[PDB]
Amino acid sequence: AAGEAHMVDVSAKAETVREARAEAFVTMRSETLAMIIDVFATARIAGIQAAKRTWDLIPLCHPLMLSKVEVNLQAEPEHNRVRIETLCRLTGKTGVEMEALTAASVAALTIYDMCKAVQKDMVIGPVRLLAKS
Amino acid sequence: LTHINAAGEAHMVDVSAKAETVREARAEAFVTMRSETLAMIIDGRHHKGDVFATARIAGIQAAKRTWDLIPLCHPLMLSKVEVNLQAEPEHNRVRIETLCRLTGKTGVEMEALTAASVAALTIYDMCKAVQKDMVIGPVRLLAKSGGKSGDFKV
Amino acid sequence: INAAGEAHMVDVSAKAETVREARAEAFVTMRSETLAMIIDGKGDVFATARIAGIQAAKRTWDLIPLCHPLMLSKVEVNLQAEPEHNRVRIETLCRLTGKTGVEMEALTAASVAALTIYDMCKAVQKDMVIGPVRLLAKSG
Amino acid sequence: TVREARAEAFVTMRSETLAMIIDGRHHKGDVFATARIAGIQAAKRTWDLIPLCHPLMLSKVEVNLQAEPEHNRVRIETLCRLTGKTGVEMEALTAASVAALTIYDMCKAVQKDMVIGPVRLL
Amino acid sequence: THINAAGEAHMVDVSAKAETVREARAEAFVTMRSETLAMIIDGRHHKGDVFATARIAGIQAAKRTWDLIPLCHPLMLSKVEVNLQAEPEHNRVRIETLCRLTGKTGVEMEALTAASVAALTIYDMCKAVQKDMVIGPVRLLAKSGGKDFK
Amino acid sequence: AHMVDVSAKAETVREARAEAFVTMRSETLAMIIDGRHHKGDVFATARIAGIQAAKRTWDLIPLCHPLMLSKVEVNLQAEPEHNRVRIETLCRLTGKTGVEMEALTAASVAALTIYDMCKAVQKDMVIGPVRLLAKSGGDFKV
Ligand SMILES: Nc1nc2c(c(=O)[nH]1)N[C@H]1C(=O)[C@H]3OP(=O)(O)OC[C@H]3O[C@H]1N2
Numbered sequence: 045a046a047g048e049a050h051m052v053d054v055s056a057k058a059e060t061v062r063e064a065r066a067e068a069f070v071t072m073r074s075e076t077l078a079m080i081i082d083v084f085a086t087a088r089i090a091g092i093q094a095a096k097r098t099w100d101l102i103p104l105c106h107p108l109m110l111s112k113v114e115v116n117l118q119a120e121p122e123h124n125r126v127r128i129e130t131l132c133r134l135t136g137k138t139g140v141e142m143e144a145l146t147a148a149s150v151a152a153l154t155i156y157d158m159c160k161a162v163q164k165d166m167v168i169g170p171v172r173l174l175a176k177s
Numbered sequence: 178l179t180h181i182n183a184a185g186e187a188h189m190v191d192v193s194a195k196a197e198t199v200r201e202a203r204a205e206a207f208v209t210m211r212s213e214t215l216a217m218i219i220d221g222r223h224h225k226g227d228v229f230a231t232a233r234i235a236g237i238q239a240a241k242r243t244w245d246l247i248p249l250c251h252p253l254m255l256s257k258v259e260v261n262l263q264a265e266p267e268h269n270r271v272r273i274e275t276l277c278r279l280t281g282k283t284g285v286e287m288e289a290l291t292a293a294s295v296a297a298l299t300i301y302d303m304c305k306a307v308q309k310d311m312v313i314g315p316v317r318l319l320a321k322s323g324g325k326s327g328d329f330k331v
Numbered sequence: 332i333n334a335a336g337e338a339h340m341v342d343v344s345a346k347a348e349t350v351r352e353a354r355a356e357a358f359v360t361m362r363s364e365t366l367a368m369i370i371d372g373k374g375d376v377f378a379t380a381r382i383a384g385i386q387a388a389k390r391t392w393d394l395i396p397l398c399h400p401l402m403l404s405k406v407e408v409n410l411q412a413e414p415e416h417n418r419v420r421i422e423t424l425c426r427l428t429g430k431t432g433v434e435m436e437a438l439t440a441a442s443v444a445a446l447t448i449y450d451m452c453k454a455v456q457k458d459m460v461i462g463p464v465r466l467l468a469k470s471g
Numbered sequence: 472t473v474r475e476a477r478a479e480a481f482v483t484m485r486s487e488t489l490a491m492i493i494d495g496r497h498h499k500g501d502v503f504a505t506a507r508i509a510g511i512q513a514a515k516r517t518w519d520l521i522p523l524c525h526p527l528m529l530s531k532v533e534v535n536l537q538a539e540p541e542h543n544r545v546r547i548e549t550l551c552r553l554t555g556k557t558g559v560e561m562e563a564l565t566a567a568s569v570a571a572l573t574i575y576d577m578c579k580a581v582q583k584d585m586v587i588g589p590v591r592l593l
Numbered sequence: 594t595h596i597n598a599a600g601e602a603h604m605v606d607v608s609a610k611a612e613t614v615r616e617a618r619a620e621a622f623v624t625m626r627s628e629t630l631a632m633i634i635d636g637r638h639h640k641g642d643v644f645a646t647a648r649i650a651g652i653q654a655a656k657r658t659w660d661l662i663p664l665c666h667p668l669m670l671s672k673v674e675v676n677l678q679a680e681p682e683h684n685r686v687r688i689e690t691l692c693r694l695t696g697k698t699g700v701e702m703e704a705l706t707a708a709s710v711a712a713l714t715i716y717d718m719c720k721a722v723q724k725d726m727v728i729g730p731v732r733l734l735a736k737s738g739g740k741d742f743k
Numbered sequence: 744a745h746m747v748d749v750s751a752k753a754e755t756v757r758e759a760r761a762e763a764f765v766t767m768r769s770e771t772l773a774m775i776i777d778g779r780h781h782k783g784d785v786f787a788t789a790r791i792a793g794i795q796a797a798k799r800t801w802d803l804i805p806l807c808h809p810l811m812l813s814k815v816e817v818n819l820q821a822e823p824e825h826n827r828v829r830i831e832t833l834c835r836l837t838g839k840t841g842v843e844m845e846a847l848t849a850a851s852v853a854a855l856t857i858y859d860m861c862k863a864v865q866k867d868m869v870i871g872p873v874r875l876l877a878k879s880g881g882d883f884k885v
Pocket residue numbers: 052054098099104105106107108137138139140141142143302305306
């Protein structure tokens with residue numbers, strides 16, 4: 045299949061409570077954790093906002109109505125990093141995997157934008173998902 | 178020394194004073210998967226379609242919404258965007274390399290990273306029916322130009 | 332200052348799917364001459380304010396960080412000239428069948444229509460005032 | 472309550488122009504892929520483009536592109552489908568129009584007087 | 594072409610080009626039955642003022658051209674005009690738009706998008722009455738960018 | 744021609760200051776300071792929200808021009824004595840177009856967020872007044 049974009053038909057599916065949790069990391073130098081925590085709130089909003097626009101960022105995703113989005117951030121001085129864990133949930137025909145992965149990635153991008161001045165090079169990753177319902 | 182105000186609060190830094198130079202930034206991303214997961218990409222056997230073309234466009238579009246995605250960034254006019262997708266069977270991964278350039282007052286690290294991130298999120302969306310536990314990463318910056326701040330390479 | 336840097340979105344999967352409704356209002360006070368500009372010399376002006384408020388309401392989830400994305404079933408925005416008060420009254424109506432109310436949509440519809448009217452008359456009068464913006468009714 | 476709608480659009484050009492889409496096999500490459508992605512994206516934003524439309528939860532968006540050298544044009548056909556309270560006509564026409572516009576943008580450099588139309592429901 | 598030698602899709606760097614006042618005119622048509630055209634004129638379509646609704650829809654679609662059309666450059670429009678006119682002799686509505694800015698890349702897509710989106714809107718207003726409407730033709734009338742046309 | 748042809752105007756430093764108020768009951772203004780509003784950090788969310796709104800003004804107000812902002816600041820300040828939150832925004836850029844709508848939209852969406860963050864507690868909060876404080880680019884203040 046060359047040059048084609050097919051969107052999966054979800055009409056036939058049942059309405060179920062679906063759920064997904066992803067995680068993402070922003071690794072940096074130890075000092076670069078000079079930390080205000082509303083720096084996290086900016087990143088927290090960015091993930092929630094990204095989660096709600098996922099159908100618009102990912103070309104083949106469905107418009108969905110999220111029941112809840114939560115974005116948590118943790119600083120791990122022992123590992124030189126910020127840990128993010130996301131949670132998206134709805135009751136519909138479509139899972140919320142991409143929403144969580146997007147919400148974690150953009151929260152990660154946001155922290156990079158906030159600290160980009162101190163360290164030119166920081167490493168975002170890994171980005172993956174813990175479990176889904 | 179941040180994207181934050183003097184008080185512990187969020188504002189938008191005034192960039193107007195600085196010099197307007199041609200700026201550039203290149204970033205990279207990796208999508209780690211199974212050998213079988215990468216093999217259906219080369220064969221075009223994922224039911225969702227052309228995975229690289231879709232990830233190419235998505236990142237390009239992602240690039241232009243960066244100021245709109247990253248809450249505090251300045252609106253910018255990208256002059257050039259390149260999103261490169263490459264298959265690496267030997268490491269079980271797709272390597273992604275992006276390139277953003279414009280003539281403005283504020284840097285372009287975020288546009289290049291964002292383009293790289295969504296191309297990765299897209300490649301994931303396109304193949305996730307086959308493998309649910311793929312790993313996105315690392316996401317890094319490879320170079321930056323035009324900035325008054327410390328320029329950077331490799 | 333507890334809960335600092337924190338952003339919780341209320342969970343709504345537990346609520347019942349019912350028809351929910353919200354009415355909001357807004358006023359834009361101006362000089363009488365500015366209010367005479369619209370009525371005497373109103374369609375192109377009220378329409379812009381009408382449309383802007385309707386599309387704005389359809390974007391409330393994009394504007395209010397912690398609001399739910401919902402699918403609006405009806406959006407009505409009426410504009411009224413009130414010469415006795417040197418002002419323009421806006422009244423909006425939002426309604427759908429879902430788990431989330433449509434309060435913010437109705438409020439946003441009113442706010443943006445207000446801002447739209449402000450932009451339209453901004454050249455004639457510098458010091459126009461928007462307010463009050465308050466909610467009129469809710470059913471849910 | 473499965474509802475469905477299909478639209479179509481044409482982007483008429485010179486036979487020389489339509490050959491740049493196929494003699495580089497771009498037609499089953501990125502050029503058609505872009506118009507296909509654009510139209511799908513546009514269809515999911517019909518409510519944001521057309522003032523009096525409702526936001527809808529689409530079950531499917533299809534954008535098929537086919538070259539008709541025989542008529543000097545690219546034929547476009549769209550398909551929108553959902554299970555809900557609102558038909559999806561505007562979504563199909565929007566997907567159809569924007570998908571045609573992307574193709575104009577692609578070949579805009581080659582020909583300055585390309586013509587889009589007709590755009591109609593099926 | 595507007596894509597890569599690779600056959601890859603990319604956005605071309607146009608920064609080297611001069612910063613000139615570019616302009617674009619496009620026209621578009623929406624053919625309907627005579628009664629449907631008259632309900633626009635009498636303003637008896639229940640949704641509301643069709644031309645005014647379409648005008649605004651077109652203006653705003655123009656400001657979103659780079660965000661709708663995937664490979665186009667982000668631009669800052671200086672002026673957008675959206676003109677609506679009924680032509681009873683042809684059973685149709687004629688749309689004529691105007692875009693212009695001081696930039697390094699043209700504004701054709703901005704005018705064409707405005708014409709199509711004003712046309713989609715006119716369709717959406719009158720759709721309840723008629724499902725037979727045909728949009729077209731949609732074409733470019735002029736360009737005075739740095740890359741002259743008419 | 745209701746969308747004004749902004750080119751060609753002089754490229755000048757343009758600035759705008761706007762203000763807005765969200766009146767509430769003292770328990771509501773108290774749970775903001777306590778930060779016992781369930782949705783979260785109210786001022787942060789309203790501060791971020793107002794800022795993005797400034798960058799989206801061109802897309803919300805039909806006849807406004809697309810522009811590129813340089814500075815957006817959103818001030819939230821609690822006024823227990825007046826049972827209200829005062830918002831003051833400041834928008835600046837260098838271009839051909841003024842920034843009044845941005846400052847006003849930012850102030851308005853920040854107000855709308857504050858309403859969103861506290862509305863579970865109080866349904867009858869009242870947003871107003873929303874006005875311009877200053878624009879520089881002739882000049883105006885007061
Ligand atoms: N917004 C959004 N749209 C989606 C998916 C998604 O995760 N988010 N998964 C895609 C899939 O591959 C399938 O996964 P799923 O979770 O089984 O649900 C059906 C499909 O939805 C598809 N469309």
